[PDB]
Structure formats: C-alpha cells, structure tokens
C-alpha cells in the first residue's frame, strides 16, 4: 500500500478544507499548498500518488507547475483544474506523469472525482 497520500496545490484554507475532508473520508492523506511551488519543495522530500494542481497563474498560467513536477518528480501524477492558453506544456505534463486536464467542470465533485480515479487507476 500504500497509503494513499494526495497532495494538492491551490489558495489553500479553503480548497484545503473542501478536499482534505472529502478525501479524509476515503482514507487517504490530503495536504494543500500555495499553488504550485511549494508541493515542488515539499516533493523534494517525499511523493504524493496524486498530485492536484489549480492553474491560475503562477508562472506559465498553471501548466508551469508541471514543469517544474517532472524536473523533479519522475512521474508524478498531477490534475490541473483547466487548461487555458498554453496547453502545450500539458501534453509534456502527461508523459512526464500527468493525470489529465480538466475542460470546464471542476469543483470537488468532479476535482475529488478525477483524483480519486487517478489512486485507482494507479493501483494496483
């Protein structure tokens, strides 16, 4: 097992709330940071199974973040929440290990949807 360990990436507070408890429910570990960066520093010491990124902005309006995962991270799975301008770098995102992109929907409906998929697919 494992464990299951989500990470995700977004305001934070708020975002972390909504998705540490829904996914607490599942039985999994749910950690938020700032929005992209940080789970990159963080990842430097250990690998979430599914990363969930937001994409508002960062650097490269989102998709920079995924850059910066496969730099590090091997083949981190990661869910970003739209994929604006720039899709380009979230192609590279899926060989690198990216999950998917998300078109319109989003929400923890369809966000905690979407990444839970993405441990069970992984399973084993």
């Known amino acids: 097992m494992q464990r299951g360990i989500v990470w ?15 996914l607490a429910g599942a039985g999994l570990t749910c950690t938020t940071f ?10 430097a010491s250990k690998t979430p199974d599914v990363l969930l990124s937001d ?8 998709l920079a973040l995924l850059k910066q995962i496969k ?3 091997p083949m981190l799975p990661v869910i970003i929440m739209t994929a604006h301008s720039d899709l380009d770098a979230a192609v590279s995102a899926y ?9 319109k929907p989003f929400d923890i409906d369809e966000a ?5 998929r993405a441990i069970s697919h992984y399973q084993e």
């Open 71 to 73: 730099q590090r991270h």
């Open 95 to 103: 060989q690198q290990g990216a999950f998917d992109y998300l078109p």
């Open 55 to 62: 994409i508002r902005m960062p650097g490269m309006d989102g």
């Open 8 to 22: 995700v990436v977004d305001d934070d507070s708020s975002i972390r709330w909504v998705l540490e408890r829904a």
């Open 112 to 116: 905690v949807a979407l990444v839970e």
């Open 34 to 43: 700032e929005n992209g960066n940080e789970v990159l520093a963080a990842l």
